[PDB]
UniProtKB/Swiss-Prot annotation:
Keywords: Cytoplasm, Heme, Iron, Metal-binding, Muscle protein, Oxidoreductase, Oxygen transport, Phosphoprotein, Transport
PANTHER family referenced in this protein's UniProt entry, alphabetically: MYOGLOBIN
Protein name: Myoglobin
EC code: 1.7.-.-, 1.11.1.-
Organism: Equus caballus (Horse)
Gene Ontology CC: sarcoplasm
Residue numbers bearing the Phosphoserine modification: S3
Similarity comment: Belongs to the globin family.
Reactions mediated catalytically: Fe(III)-heme b-[protein] + nitric oxide + H2O = Fe(II)-heme b-[protein] + nitrite + 2 H(+); H2O2 + AH2 = A + 2 H2O
Length: 151
């Protein structure tokens, strides 16, 4: 788990995201899709996108970025008490969307990248440690549910 101090850093960082949820969501997804094109193949509504310009021009991509980061924000604000929030996502992502757990590592990495890209010099080493721990805890708890489902 995270300490109280670590959670405070996580949620302070998250304030940056909340100020521009759509632009952070868009940049995270673009980073994911560009760095790991296999991920793009799991979205029927995005698998048409060949270029970053197309992705950049897609209002539905930005829309989905808002949905994804809203969901993660809700999870993070539970500070680890997130079973109810995480369970349905684990089940839809393992059973319906068929998303390998590695893709959650890819998006975690993309989030850390985008935060430094958008806030260079303002995402300190303590803050990155805390946000990393939070994203690891999320992954770990998703992973436990994936194992239950054999995915």
């Amino acid at each position: 788990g995270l300490s109280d101090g670590e959670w405070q850093q996580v949620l302070n960082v998250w304030g940056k995201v909340e100020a521009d949820i759509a632009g952070h969501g868009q940049e995270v997804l673009i980073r994911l899709f560009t760095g790991h094109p296999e991920t793009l193949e799991k979205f029927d509504k995005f698998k048409h996108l060949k270029t970053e310009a197309e992705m950049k021009a897609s209002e539905d991509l930005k829309k989905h970025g808002t949905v994804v980061l809203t969901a993660l924000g809700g999870i993070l604000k539970k500070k680890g008490h997130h079973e109810a929030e995480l369970k349905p996502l684990a089940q839809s992502h393992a059973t319906k969307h068929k998303i390998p757990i590695k893709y959650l590592e890819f998006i975690s990495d993309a989030i850390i990248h985008v935060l430094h890209s958008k806030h260079p010099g303002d995402f300190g080493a303590d803050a990155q440690g805390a946000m990393t721990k939070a994203l690891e805890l999320f992954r770990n708890d998703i992973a436990a549910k994936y194992k239950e489902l054999g995915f």
